[PDB]
C-alpha cells in the first residue's frame, strides 16, 4: 500500500481519461488491499459509470457504498439517475442490444435514487427528472403510466422538459396506442418552448371527451349514456338503439383484435419504433461528458469520414468510431 | 476418519477466498480498450491449484508466456509460512534432497 492520496490521484485520472473498466478494477482491488474508499472515491467511480452508462455497475457501486456506510451526497445522486439514462438499449436487425437490461430494474433504481435524494434533504436537478423518465420509456420498456405521473409532478415543481425526453416519450406513447397522451405532449412542448417542438402543435380532438380511467369506474356503477360514454361521435352522428348498439360494439371489439393478432411478416415481432433503434451514449463516438446531454445518442458515421482526417495508408485516431 | 479431511477440503474449495484467488483470466472487454493503456493492455496474474485446476494445460511452451521455469523450487521459498509441503513435494521442479 502506497500513499492513499496517490490512490485517489490515479482514480481521478482514469475517470477523466480512460474508460469505465479501469475505475472498476482499481477501486475494487484497491478496496481488497485495504484502501478506505470515502465519498470522493465513489464519486469518481460513479462519474465514469454514469458517462459510459453501465447500469449494472452503478448497482454494484451503490451496494458497496451502502456496505461501507458512506453517505451519498447530491453529486452522487446526480450520477445514479443520469447513469441509468445513458444505458445501451434498442434493436439491431433482429438482435436485441442489452437484453439483460430488462431483468435489472434500472428504471426503479433511477426512481429509488430520486426518492432517497428528496428524503435525505438534497435538491434534485432538472436533468435527473428528465433522465428518470427516459428509463421508463426507452424501446425495450413500456412504462407510460409511471412516466405520466412523473411528468405530472415535474410540472408542479416548475421543471423544464428536455428535448431528448420529449423525443423518447412521444415514441413510447404512439407505440402503446396513446394518441391522446401524445397529442397532449406535443401541445405541451410547444407551449413551454422546448427546442425542436415550437412548430409541432396539434389541436385537441379529445376536448369534450372525458378521461379513459373515469369512464371505467362509471361503467361499473343517464343509463343509456352510461354504457356509451366511451363512444366517440362527430356531432353529426347519433347512437343506435341500445340493443342494436351493444351488438355493434362487440362487432368492433372482435374486429380490432382480429387485425392486431396478425403478425407483420418482416418485423421480428417488433414495432416500427424499435426497428433500427440501436443506442449507445455519446462517449462511443469521439465525444466526452457534457451536462446538457442526458441520454445522447452517438453521432452517425457520416460525421467523420476516413481519408479526410488522415491520408491513404496512414492511421487515423478513431479506433472504435465506425463500429456500432 | 477420511470424512473429516474430505469435508475440510470440500469446504476449503467453496470458500470465497479460494474462489477469489483462483478466478479465471480477465477478458479484453473486462480490462478495457484494444490497448495502448499501460497495465490494462494484458490480463492479470492467474493463480492455479495443481490438484484442482480451473484451466486445461497449466504449462505451455510459448515464446513469451513460458512458465515451466517458474514452477521450480525457489519461487515458493518466498512464502514458506503459508506453504503446503505435500503440494510442494508433488508439484515442484528441482527440489533438493
Amino acid at each position: 500500500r502506497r500513499d492513499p492520496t496517490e490512490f485517489l490521484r490515479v482514480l481521478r485520472r482514469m475517470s477523466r481519461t480512460t474508460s469505465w473498466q479501469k475505475t472498476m478494477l482499481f477501486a475494487s482491488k484497491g478496496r481488497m488491499v485495504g484502501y478506505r474508499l470515502t465519498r470522493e472515491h465513489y464519486n469518481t467511480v460513479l462519474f465514469s459509470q454514469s458517462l459510459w452508462g453501465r447500469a449494472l455497475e452503478i448497482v454494484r457501486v451503490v451496494r458497496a457504498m451502502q456496505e461501507d456506510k458512506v453517505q451519498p451526497n447530491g453529486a452522487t445522486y446526480y450520477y445514479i439517475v443520469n447513469g441509468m439514462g445513458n444505458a445501451d438499449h434498442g434493436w439491431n436487425y433482429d438482435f436485441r442490444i442489452n437484453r439483460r437490461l430488462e431483468k435489472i430494474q434500472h428504471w426503479r433504481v433511477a426512481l429509488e435514487a430520486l426518492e432517497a435524494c428528496e428524503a435525505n434533504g438534497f435538491d434534485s436537478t432538472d436533468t435527473m427528472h428528465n433522465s428518470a423518465l427516459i428509463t421508463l420509456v426507452i424501446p425495450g420498456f413500456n412504462r407510460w403510466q409511471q412516466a405520466s405521473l412523473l411528468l405530472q409532478r415535474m410540472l408542479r415543481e416548475d421543471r423544464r422538459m428536455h428535448p431528448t425526453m420529449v423525443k423518447f416519450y412521444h415514441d413510447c406513447l404512439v407505440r402503446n396506442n396513446r394518441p391522446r397522451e401524445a397529442s397532449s405532449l406535443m401541445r405541451l412542448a410547444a407551449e413551454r418552448g422546448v427546442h425542436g417542438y415550437e412548430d409541432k402543435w396539434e389541436a385537441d380532438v379529445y376536448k369534450g371527451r372525458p378521461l379513459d380511467s373515469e369512464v371505467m369506474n362509471e361503467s361499473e356503477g343517464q343509463a343509456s349514456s352510461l354504457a356509451f360514454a366511451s363512444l366517440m361521435l362527430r356531432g353529426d352522428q347519433r347512437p343506435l338503439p341500445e340493443n342494436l348498439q351493444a351488438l355493434l360494439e362487440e362487432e368492433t371489439t372482435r374486429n380490432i383484435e382480429a387485425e392486431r393478432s396478425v403478425p407483420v411478416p418482416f418485423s421480428a415481432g417488433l414495432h416500427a419504433t424499435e426497428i433500427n433503434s440501436v443506442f449507445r451514449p455519446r462517449v462511443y463516438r469521439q465525444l466526452w461528458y457534457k451536462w446538457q446531454h442526458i441520454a445522447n445518442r452517438y453521432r452517425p458515421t457520416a460525421a467523420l469520414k476516413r481519408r479526410q482526417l488522415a491520408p491513404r495508408d496512414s492511421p487515423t485516431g478513431i479506433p472504435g468510431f465506425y463500429r456500432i | 476418519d477420511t470424512e473429516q479431511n474430505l469435508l475440510a477440503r470440500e469446504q476449503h474449495v467453496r470458500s470465497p477466498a479460494y474462489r477469489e484467488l483462483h478466478r479465471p483470466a480477465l477478458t479484453n472487454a473486462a480490462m478495457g480498450l484494444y490497448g495502448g493503456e499501460p497495465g490494462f493492455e494484458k490480463a492479470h496474474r492467474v493463480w492455479v491449484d495443481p490438484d484442482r485446476p480451473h484451466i486445461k494445460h497449466i504449462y505451455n511452451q510459448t515464446a513469451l508466456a513460458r512458465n515451466l521455469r517458474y514452477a521450480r523450487y525457489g519461487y515458493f521459498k518466498r512464502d514458506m509460512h503459508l506453504l503446503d509441503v505435500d503440494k510442494l513435494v508433488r508439484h515442484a521442479r528441482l527440489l533438493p534432497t
Partner: peptide
C-alpha cells in the same frame, strides 16, 4: 487451507501494482 488469505492479499496487491503501472512516472 489457512494461508490462502495472505496469498490472496499478495495477489491483489500485485494486481494493484500492475494497475499502478497506468500512472507511469512517480
Amino acid at each position: 487451507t489457512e494461508g490462502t488469505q495472505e496469498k490472496l492479499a499478495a495477489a491483489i496487491q500485485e494486481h494493484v501494482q500492475d494497475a499502478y503501472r497506468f500512472s507511469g512516472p512517480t
